[PDB]
Write an enzyme that holds these catalytic residues in place. Structure first.
Site, PDB file in Angstrom:
ATOM      1  N   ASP A   1       0.827  -1.224   0.123  1.00 26.04           N
ATOM      2  CA  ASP A   1       0.007  -0.049  -0.065  1.00 26.04           C
ATOM      3  C   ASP A   1       0.861   1.301  -0.049  1.00 26.04           C
ATOM      4  O   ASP A   1       2.233   1.431   0.530  1.00 26.04           O
ATOM      5  CB  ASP A   1      -0.948   0.176   1.077  1.00 26.04           C
ATOM      6  CG  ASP A   1      -2.253  -0.711   0.972  1.00 26.04           C
ATOM      7  OD1 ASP A   1      -2.820  -0.191  -0.056  1.00 26.04           O
ATOM      8  OD2 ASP A   1      -2.517  -1.454   1.509  1.00 26.04           O
TER       9      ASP A   1
ATOM     10  N   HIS B   1       3.255   3.113  -8.761  1.00 26.58           N
ATOM     11  CA  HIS B   1       3.226   1.644  -8.726  1.00 26.58           C
ATOM     12  C   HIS B   1       4.153   1.152  -9.271  1.00 26.58           C
ATOM     13  O   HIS B   1       4.909  -0.152  -9.112  1.00 26.58           O
ATOM     14  CB  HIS B   1       1.997   1.301  -9.664  1.00 26.58           C
ATOM     15  CG  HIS B   1       0.717   1.457  -9.142  1.00 26.58           C
ATOM     16  ND1 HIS B   1      -0.438   0.668  -8.892  1.00 26.58           N
ATOM     17  CD2 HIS B   1       0.000   2.566  -8.403  1.00 26.58           C
ATOM     18  CE1 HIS B   1      -1.339   0.943  -8.341  1.00 26.58           C
ATOM     19  NE2 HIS B   1      -1.065   2.353  -8.060  1.00 26.58           N
TER      20      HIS B   1
ATOM     21  N   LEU C   1      14.530 -18.417  -2.593  1.00 21.95           N
ATOM     22  CA  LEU C   1      13.398 -17.585  -2.298  1.00 21.95           C
ATOM     23  C   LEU C   1      12.345 -17.911  -3.272  1.00 21.95           C
ATOM     24  O   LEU C   1      12.572 -17.680  -4.516  1.00 21.95           O
ATOM     25  CB  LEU C   1      13.496 -16.118  -1.852  1.00 21.95           C
ATOM     26  CG  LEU C   1      11.996 -15.544  -1.400  1.00 21.95           C
ATOM     27  CD1 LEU C   1      12.592 -14.124  -0.539  1.00 21.95           C
ATOM     28  CD2 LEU C   1      11.300 -15.130  -2.754  1.00 21.95           C
TER      29      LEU C   1
HETATM   30  C1  FPP Z   1       2.856  -8.156 -10.723  1.00 18.70           C
HETATM   31  C2  FPP Z   1       4.072  -7.090 -10.554  1.00 18.70           C
HETATM   32  C3  FPP Z   1       5.135  -7.138 -11.497  1.00 18.70           C
HETATM   33  C4  FPP Z   1       3.854  -6.420  -9.508  1.00 18.70           C
HETATM   34  C5  FPP Z   1       4.849  -5.062  -9.064  1.00 18.70           C
HETATM   35  C6  FPP Z   1       4.323  -4.253  -8.206  1.00 18.70           C
HETATM   36  C7  FPP Z   1       2.964  -3.475  -8.336  1.00 18.70           C
HETATM   37  C8  FPP Z   1       2.450  -3.839  -9.995  1.00 18.70           C
HETATM   38  C9  FPP Z   1       2.318  -3.048  -7.557  1.00 18.70           C
HETATM   39  C10 FPP Z   1       0.878  -2.619  -7.480  1.00 18.70           C
HETATM   40  C11 FPP Z   1       0.016  -3.122  -6.420  1.00 18.70           C
HETATM   41  C12 FPP Z   1      -1.131  -2.369  -6.118  1.00 18.70           C
HETATM   42  C13 FPP Z   1      -2.198  -2.546  -7.123  1.00 18.70           C
HETATM   43  C14 FPP Z   1      -1.203  -1.136  -5.178  1.00 18.70           C
HETATM   44  C15 FPP Z   1      -2.161  -0.399  -5.123  1.00 18.70           C
HETATM   45  O1  FPP Z   1      -1.607   0.582  -4.073  1.00 18.70           O
HETATM   46  P1  FPP Z   1      -2.717   1.830  -4.072  1.00 18.70           P
HETATM   47  O2  FPP Z   1      -2.990   2.665  -5.130  1.00 18.70           O
HETATM   48  O3  FPP Z   1      -3.756   1.507  -3.089  1.00 18.70           O
HETATM   49  O4  FPP Z   1      -1.754   2.926  -3.092  1.00 18.70           O
HETATM   50  P2  FPP Z   1      -2.552   4.247  -2.239  1.00 18.70           P
HETATM   51  O5  FPP Z   1      -3.096   3.489  -0.830  1.00 18.70           O
HETATM   52  O6  FPP Z   1      -1.314   5.249  -1.871  1.00 18.70           O
HETATM   53  O7  FPP Z   1      -3.338   4.734  -3.416  1.00 18.70           O
END
Ligand code: FPP
Ligand code: FPP
Lengths: 230, 231
Positions: A14, A31, A125
């Site tokens: 998050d 992201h 891992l």
């Molecule tokens: C599959 C892969 C390669 C993943 C790599 C990392 C990745 C894509 C992370 C995104 C995860 C995600 C939807 C977070 C949302 O945070 P948010 O927008 O809720 O954060 P906020 O609370 O600040 O809005």
């Protein structure tokens, strides 16, 4: 020094948006930095000897977000195969994914499956990507497969036990003493569970930190592994 | 001056009865009676604030390993609660219900709980939900087992199996549907573990952890938790 180390760590990522908004950056940019953070945390966890990490990537509730954000997140696993999987592969990291694949884009699914095929013999891992994943949804498909094996008479309803349901979850592919996270980390101060490994995490230690996920680093992973205790 | 959002359904993991008693040079078991005393206060205070349901984790199936004596002392608890406490919850319009596996309870305990239910079954206030002999994975397994049995009987087609459906087979099925899932789960005594409590129903709950031991958890501490609830 020395602390008990979690064998399996779940991670709820998050703060990508807050991290980007705080820096006068576009939301989506956050992201990608979260993915940058994952490379650091994934490498650091491997150094300490953590056996599995399940990171919650794209929850089933997430498709509601504006298409653009979805398009941007879904492209993330494409660059990770080209630009990040080599370093994890060089570090002996196994890449696996759990969740619902049928509804993924093709460029994303191929990048994930290639990343798996690349690393399938690796013995370090296991980086376990939860994509298109929801815990209640996971248990329901498992309850469906079991219903179908009961109608086919492969198993009698009497054979349905806790051990059995465990063999049908998306985490079935992990070794049995490692299927359940020992620790689940959630960043950015949120104290909600958000449908993440509801079955497997039933007995997990929880760690909540205000650090935003893109700011979560080797040091922050270490602040969490120390705090693990029992 | 401003109102706080209040959780409709509160799950409570009651920890610290032993620590509370050892800290006070009291026998370990005595703390659990004090834990029950705390529950009357918390149950009363929540009812005043308008909470519709409380599910308190009383006795998990892992708890039977404890020394027979401690089990013998806990299991007598619902007898004194019927005699000494259920009247006051009844006077306060509190409905008493229990979830968990009843078949493996003692008889004096099962009878005290079932009478407690029968006494209060028409009450329309807060629902005090006792989780006794309860485990979430076990709850889901019995829920998934019965469904397999209804599919073999062809009562439901495998196609009828949805999230809504599994929900109707959990021990929380008897609650109204908008109230089946806790909005808040409280755990006392500083423990950040989940301990198998409502794994399905709590999948989206806000969590509140406090170092306060359960027998010291009171209306003031309940209010610290409802305030801290936010969204
Ligand atoms: C599959 C892969 C390669 C993943 C790599 C990392 C990745 C894509 C992370 C995104 C995860 C995600 C939807 C977070 C949302 O945070 P948010 O927008 O809720 O954060 P906020 O609370 O600040 O809005
Ligand atoms: C009517 C009725 C059933 C009343 C029961 C009230 C009551 C005594 C609840 C406590 C249940 C329990 C086993 C507490 C043990 O906590 P612990 O201090 O052993 O906690 P730990 O798991 O953290 O060691």
């Amino acid at each position: 020094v020395p602390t008990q180390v979690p064998a399996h760590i779940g991670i709820i990522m998050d703060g990508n948006g807050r991290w980007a908004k705080k820096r006068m950056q576009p939301r989506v940019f956050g992201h990608k930095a979260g993915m940058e953070a994952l490379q650091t945390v994934t490498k650091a966890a491997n150094k300490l000897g953590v056996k599995v990490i399940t990171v919650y990537a794209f929850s089933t509730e997430n498709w509601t977000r504006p298409d653009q954000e979805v398009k941007f997140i879904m492209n993330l696993p494409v660059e990770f195969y080209d630009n990040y999987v080599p370093e994890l592969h060089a570090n002996n990291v196994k890449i696996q994914m759990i969740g619902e694949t049928d509804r993924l884009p093709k460029q994303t699914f191929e990048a994930l499956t290639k990343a798996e095929e690349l690393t399938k013999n690796n013995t370090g891992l296991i980086l376990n990507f939860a994509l298109n994943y929801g815990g209640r949804a996971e248990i329901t498909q498992a309850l469906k497969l079991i219903s179908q094996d009961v109608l086919d008479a492969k198993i009698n309803p009497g054979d349905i036990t806790e051990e059995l349901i465990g063999n049908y979850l998306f985490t079935q592919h992990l070794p049995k003493d490692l299927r359940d996270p020992d620790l689940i980390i959630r960043t950015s101060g949120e104290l909600r569970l958000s449908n993440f490994l509801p079955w497997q995490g039933a007995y997990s230690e929880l760690y909540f930190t205000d650090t935003l996920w893109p700011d979560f680093d080797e040091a922050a992973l270490q602040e969490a592994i120390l705090a693990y205790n029992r």
